[PDB]
Amino acid sequence: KCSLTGKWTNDLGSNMTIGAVNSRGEFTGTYTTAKESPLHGTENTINKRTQPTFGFTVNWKFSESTTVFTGQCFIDRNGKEVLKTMWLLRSSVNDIGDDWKATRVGINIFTRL
Amino acid sequence: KCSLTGKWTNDLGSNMTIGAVNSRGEFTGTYTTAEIKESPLHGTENTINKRTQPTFGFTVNWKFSESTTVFTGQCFIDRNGKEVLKTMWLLRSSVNDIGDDWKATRVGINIFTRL
Amino acid sequence: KCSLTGKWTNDLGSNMTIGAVNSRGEFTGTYTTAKESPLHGTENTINKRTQPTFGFTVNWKFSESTTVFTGQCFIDRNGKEVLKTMWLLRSSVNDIGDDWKATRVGINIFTRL
Amino acid sequence: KCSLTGKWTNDLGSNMTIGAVNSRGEFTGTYTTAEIKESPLHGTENTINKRTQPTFGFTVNWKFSESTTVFTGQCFIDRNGKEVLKTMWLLRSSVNDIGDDWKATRVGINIFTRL
Numbered sequence: 176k177c178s179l180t181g182k183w184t185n186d187l188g189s190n191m192t193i194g195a196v197n198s199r200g201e202f203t204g205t206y207t208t209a210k211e212s213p214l215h216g217t218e219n220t221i222n223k224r225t226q227p228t229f230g231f232t233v234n235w236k237f238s239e240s241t242t243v244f245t246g247q248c249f250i251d252r253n254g255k256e257v258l259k260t261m262w263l264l265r266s267s268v269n270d271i272g273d274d275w276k277a278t279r280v281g282i283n284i285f286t287r288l
Numbered sequence: 289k290c291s292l293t294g295k296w297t298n299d300l301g302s303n304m305t306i307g308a309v310n311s312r313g314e315f316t317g318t319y320t321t322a323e324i325k326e327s328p329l330h331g332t333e334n335t336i337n338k339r340t341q342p343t344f345g346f347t348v349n350w351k352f353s354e355s356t357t358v359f360t361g362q363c364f365i366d367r368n369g370k371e372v373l374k375t376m377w378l379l380r381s382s383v384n385d386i387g388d389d390w391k392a393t394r395v396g397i398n399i400f401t402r403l
Numbered sequence: 404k405c406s407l408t409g410k411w412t413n414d415l416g417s418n419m420t421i422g423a424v425n426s427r428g429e430f431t432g433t434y435t436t437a438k439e440s441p442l443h444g445t446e447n448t449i450n451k452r453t454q455p456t457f458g459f460t461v462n463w464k465f466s467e468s469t470t471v472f473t474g475q476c477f478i479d480r481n482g483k484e485v486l487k488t489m490w491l492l493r494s495s496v497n498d499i500g501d502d503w504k505a506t507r508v509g510i511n512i513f514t515r516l
Numbered sequence: 517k518c519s520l521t522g523k524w525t526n527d528l529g530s531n532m533t534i535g536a537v538n539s540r541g542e543f544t545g546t547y548t549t550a551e552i553k554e555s556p557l558h559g560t561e562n563t564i565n566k567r568t569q570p571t572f573g574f575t576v577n578w579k580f581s582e583s584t585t586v587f588t589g590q591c592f593i594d595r596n597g598k599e600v601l602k603t604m605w606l607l608r609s610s611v612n613d614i615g616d617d618w619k620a621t622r623v624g625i626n627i628f629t630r631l
């Protein structure tokens with residue numbers, strides 16, 4: 176199967192740790208990068224798949240931004256677990272007139288540390 | 289003051305209710321979509337500078353599919369004295385093989401108001 | 404049908420004008436906002452649809468950014484032509500290490516001016 | 517110096533050749549995807565400060581479908597002395613009715629190198 180629980184690291188030099196996905200599929204973890212912000216997510220548990228679909232939020236302790244990730248767990252063709260993800264990074268604006276430029280979008284690949 | 293606890297609605301006629309957010313900043317809620325189908329939502333509201341219009345984010349875990357939708361946004365105070373939720377979302381679909389990852393993520397927009 | 408050719412305006416106070424889609428589907432136009440940058444695009448011409456799918460690029464004359472739009476022409480339920488679009492706004496970075504924060508993503512609805 | 521004229525390849529094994537860009541800054545090319553299927557591409561390279569690594573953008577008009585793919589990017593000079601094209605893309609699908617607009621746009625990533 177492909178568990179999320181554990182430590183992961185990405186193509187950007189940003190490690191990550193994930194707790195034990197509970198009954199209803201929730202979990203928490205921590206995110207580390209050049210700080211240490213809290214993480215909260217949910218892995219889709221329906222057809223009890225082996226390559227689950229998931230999503231989590233990160234509220235930074237060093238600023239008023241939020242990043243959300245969606246992604247899937249894959250057992251790569253080379254046998255490794257890989258989290259392919261995509262994110263939305265929201266910035267805090269002042270006026271509803273500047274909303275248009277608050278969202279950034281990116282990719283990010285993780286692996287077991 | 290822009291608070292997230294409440295019952296919001298949108299441009300697609302999708303309802304959502306969010307409970308009270310705790311000390312840390314998290315909350316849960318329900319997402320009634322479109323059949324009528326409910327789904328639990330879990331997310332956090334940023335609480336750095338206790339800014340009246342915070343930045344939030346949550347996950348929707350579809351009960352009727354094996355996909356996930358993550359939402360980011362800003363609780364804005366509308367000009368006429370109301371709250372509006374501008375959000376962006378990314379819908380992830382489950383694909384059997386890593387080879388089709390490229391076609392598994394959609395992006396869209398949503399905007400909510402007090403029900 | 405739903406022609407792109409003409410003047411359009413959006414929910415952001417940014418007008419736009421489009422030339423005569425040629426044989427192969429290409430076109431040019433101009434974009435106006437609070438400057439006046441050039442526009443180049445292509446409307447998908449295959450099944451000669453009445454609500455075509457399209458895409459164009461905008462290279463700003465006031466900075467080193469580019470925005471690309473994809474979208475479709477719809478005859479709304481109220482009978483109006485509406486261009487629903489989504490864009491990617493790329494910023495110029497210095498190092499391949501900062502690439503991650505160059506792309507912004509948004510929505511934008513147009514109507515016949 | 518990062519020039520766009522050339523034959524690039526990628527992580528998906530999709531080839532692309534772009535011609536010479538004119539004074540204004542536009543170019544055309546071919547997009548060989550995956551059957552082998554070619555598609556004309558049209559785009560512009562930003563030419564403000566004549567910056568060695570410019571910002572570009574183009575459209576791919578699929579010959580085999582009624583969809584459009586727009587690409588943005590930056591011609592970066594890789595650390596070991598090569599050119600890399602980091603791009604983001606948005607794939608638009610044709611939907612019969614405006615009611616399903618929300619589910620018609622995908623977003624992804626691509627990265628190219630000299631073939």
Ligand SMILES: O=C(O)CCCCCNC(=O)CCCC[C@@H]1SC[C@@H]2NC(=O)N[C@@H]21
Nearest residue numbers: 187189208235238240242262264281283503
């Ligand atoms: O706006 C500018 O020009 C730069 C501003 C200073 C840095 C801004 N950063 C923030 O607010 C939060 C840091 C987020 C790091 C991101 S999340 C998306 C991406 N994936 C990953 O593993 N790290 C990056």
Ligand SMILES: O=C(O)CCCCCNC(=O)CCCC[C@@H]1SC[C@@H]2NC(=O)N[C@@H]21
Nearest residue numbers: 300302350353354355357377379396398618
């Ligand atoms: O893949 C196809 O071609 C269609 C598949 C059938 C429907 C797929 N839908 C799902 O798995 C979950 C429903 C999510 C509804 C989305 S979340 C993003 C958007 N915002 C909103 O308020 N509703 C929609």
Ligand SMILES: O=C(O)CCCCCNC(=O)CCCC[C@@H]1SC[C@@H]2NC(=O)N[C@@H]21
Nearest residue numbers: 275415417436463466468470490492509511
């Ligand atoms: O980076 C900041 O904090 C702000 C920088 C100053 C303004 C940046 N703007 C640019 O480089 C180009 C202007 C693009 C306007 C955008 S294109 C996406 C959106 N749709 C539309 O009709 N107008 C806006």
Ligand SMILES: O=C(O)CCCCCNC(=O)CCCC[C@@H]1SC[C@@H]2NC(=O)N[C@@H]21
Nearest residue numbers: 390528530578581582583585605607624626
């Ligand atoms: O809608 C479905 O469920 C699948 C439909 C059949 C395939 C749809 N494809 C198309 O209409 C055009 C092919 C585009 C290929 C894309 S462009 C974005 C990505 N980058 C790249 O190098 N190849 C892919």
Ligand SMILES: *[C@H]1O[C@H](CO)[C@@H](O)[C@H](O)[C@H]1NC(C)=O
Nearest residue numbers: 184188189190207208209288
């Ligand atoms: C964890 O991963 C490696 C080694 O542990 C290194 O990047 C650093 O120690 C950590 N990464 C981050 C982003 O802190």
Ligand SMILES: *[C@H]1O[C@H](CO)[C@@H](O)[C@H](O)[C@H]1NC(C)=O
Nearest residue numbers: 301302303320321322324403
């Ligand atoms: C939810 O919104 C209101 C409830 O206040 C109701 O009139 C409407 O029909 C409901 N819509 C959905 C999608 O559940």
Ligand SMILES: *[C@H]1O[C@H](CO)[C@@H](O)[C@H](O)[C@H]1NC(C)=O
Nearest residue numbers: 412416417418435436437516
């Ligand atoms: C064109 O649209 C209206 C009236 O023509 C107004 O916004 C302005 O004159 C123009 N718009 C822009 C963005 O220049």
Ligand SMILES: *[C@H]1O[C@H](CO)[C@@H](O)[C@H](O)[C@H]1NC(C)=O
Nearest residue numbers: 529530531548549550552631
């Ligand atoms: C294109 O790339 C090279 C041509 O130099 C060739 O070996 C490869 O098979 C081609 N791939 C596609 C998708 O056309």
